Amino acid sequence: RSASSLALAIAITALYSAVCAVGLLGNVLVMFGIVRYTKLKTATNIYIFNLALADALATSTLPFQSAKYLMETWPFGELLCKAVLSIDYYNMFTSIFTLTMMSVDRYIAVCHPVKALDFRTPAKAKLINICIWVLASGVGVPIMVMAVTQPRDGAVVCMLQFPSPSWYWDTVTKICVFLFAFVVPILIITVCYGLMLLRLRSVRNIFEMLRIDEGLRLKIYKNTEGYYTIGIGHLLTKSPSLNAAKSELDKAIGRNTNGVITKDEAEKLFNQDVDAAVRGILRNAKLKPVYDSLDAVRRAALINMVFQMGETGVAGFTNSLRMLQQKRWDEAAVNLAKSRWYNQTPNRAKRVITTFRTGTWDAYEKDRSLRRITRMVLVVVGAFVVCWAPIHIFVIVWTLVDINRRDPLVVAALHLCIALGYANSSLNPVLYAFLDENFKRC
Numbered sequence: 001r002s003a004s005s006l007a008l009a010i011a012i013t014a015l016y017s018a019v020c021a022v023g024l025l026g027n028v029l030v031m032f033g034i035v036r037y038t039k040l041k042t043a044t045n046i047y048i049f050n051l052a053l054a055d056a057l058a059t060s061t062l063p064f065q066s067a068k069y070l071m072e073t074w075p076f077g078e079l080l081c082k083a084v085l086s087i088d089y090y091n092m093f094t095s096i097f098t099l100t101m102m103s104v105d106r107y108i109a110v111c112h113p114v115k116a117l118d119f120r121t122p123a124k125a126k127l128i129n130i131c132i133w134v135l136a137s138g139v140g141v142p143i144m145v146m147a148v149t150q151p152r153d154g155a156v157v158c159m160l161q162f163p164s165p166s167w168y169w170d171t172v173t174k175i176c177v178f179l180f181a182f183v184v185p186i187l188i189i190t191v192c193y194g195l196m197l198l199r200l201r202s203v204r205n206i207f208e209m210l211r212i213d214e215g216l217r218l219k220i221y222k223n224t225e226g227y228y229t230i231g232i233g234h235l236l237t238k239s240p241s242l243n244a245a246k247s248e249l250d251k252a253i254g255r256n257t258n259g260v261i262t263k264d265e266a267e268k269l270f271n272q273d274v275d276a277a278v279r280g281i282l283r284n285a286k287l288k289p290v291y292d293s294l295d296a297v298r299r300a301a302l303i304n305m306v307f308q309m310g311e312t313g314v315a316g317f318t319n320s321l322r323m324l325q326q327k328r329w330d331e332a333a334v335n336l337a338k339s340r341w342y343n344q345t346p347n348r349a350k351r352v353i354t355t356f357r358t359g360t361w362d363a364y365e366k367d368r369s370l371r372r373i374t375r376m377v378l379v380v381v382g383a384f385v386v387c388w389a390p391i392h393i394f395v396i397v398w399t400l401v402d403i404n405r406r407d408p409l410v411v412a413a414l415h416l417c418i419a420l421g422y423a424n425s426s427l428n429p430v431l432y433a434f435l436d437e438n439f440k441r442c
C-alpha cells in the first residue's frame, strides 16, 4: 500500500510546498506594490490586487492540505477545517469573478474608447472588488459553517455536511458550482474577448472599406477631381469659390464651421452619404436587380462604386453589369479593368475589382495585433482556464460518471488536477513580471 501511496504523497508535499512559497510571497509582494506606489494605481491593476489577495489566501493553506495526503487524517481541529475549506471555495469563486470583470473592463476600455474615459476610474474597480467578495460570501458564509469534522471509518474527516438528504444537496452544489464558477463566466469572457479580437483584423464591412478608400481629413481639401470635399469623401460644391464651400458646410452641419469639423460630425455625414448611396441603388431600375442578385460583399463593392461616382455613372457599364449578374466573375473583372474608371483612380479601382472577382475583403486586408495590457489580461485568463478546466470538468464527471476511485491511474489523474488548479495561484506573479511595463521597470 505504501510503496504506491507514500512516494506520491511526499512528492505532492514538496510540490505543494513550492507552490506555497512562490505563490504566497509573489502575490503578497504584488499586493504590497499596488498599494505603496502611485505609478501602479490603475483599474486593471487594482483588479490584479484582488486576484493576488485571493491566490495568496489560497496558497497559505497549502501546508495543511499536504498534511492531509501524508497523514491520511485531519489532526489540526475543526475551526482550521472550516477555514481551509471556506478559503478554498472563496479562491475558486473570487478568482473567476475578478477575471471576468477584468475582461469586461478591458473590453470597455478598448472597444468603447470614447465613453471609456467616463466610468473607468480606479474607485470603480475598488467598488467592484468589494462587490465580488460579497457575492462570493453568498456561497462562502454557508460553506464556512457547513464545514465539519466527522469520523469516517478509520480516520477523522474534514468535510461538508449537507442537511439530509445529503447526496441531493451535494449534486445540486456540484452543478451550481459547475455553472457559475465555470460555464457562465468563461462564456462572458469569450463574448468580450471574442469581440475585441474580431474587431482588430483587417476590414469586413462597407463602412471600414470606404474608410480605407476615401480616407479621412478634418479640414477642407481639394479632391482627386479638384472639388471642395471634407471628411470622408463628402463633396461640398463645384464652385471654385472657397467661401461657397464653407457656406454649404455650415448649411450641412448647422453651426459656424470655421473650415474644420469634428470626427463625430464627419461620421454623422458619412452615414447619410452611404444611405443616399443605397437609396440611389434601389431607386435606379438598372441597379436593383443586379444588387439583389449579389452576396453581401460584392454588394458592398457595388455600393463603393455608387458612393464614388453615383447611380448615374454606375448604370452606364451595362455589359459589365450583365457579366456580374451572370456570375461570370473574371469576365466582369476583364470588362471593368479597361474603362475610364480604372484610368482615373487605378489603385482603388484595382482593389474594388479584385473584391468583385474573389468575393472577399482580401484586397484590403492589413493586420494589426492586440495591445500591451489587453494581451496580458488575455494570457492571465488563458492560464486560469487551462489550470481550472480539468479539475472543474472532472468534479462534474466524477459525481456523474461511474468507475470512480477504481485504480491509482485515475486517482493520480484527479490529484494531479487538484494540484494544477492550485499551481495557478503561484503562476500569476510570474506572469506579471513578463507582461507589464509597470511591473518590469521596478
Ligand SMILES: Oc1ccc2c3c1O[C@H]1c4[nH]c5ccccc5c4C[C@@]4(O)[C@@H](C2)N(CC2CC2)CC[C@]314
Binding pocket: 088, 089, 092, 173, 174, 177, 391, 392, 395, 398, 417, 418, 419, 421, 422
Ligand atoms: O465543487 C468543486 C469544484 C471544483 C473543486 C472542488 C469543488 O469541491 C471540492 C471537491 N470535491 C470533490 C470531490 C471529488 C473530487 C474532487 C473534489 C473536489 C475538488 C475541490 O476540492 C477543488 C476543486 N477545490 C478547488 C481547488 C483545487 C482548485 C474546490 C473544492 C473542490
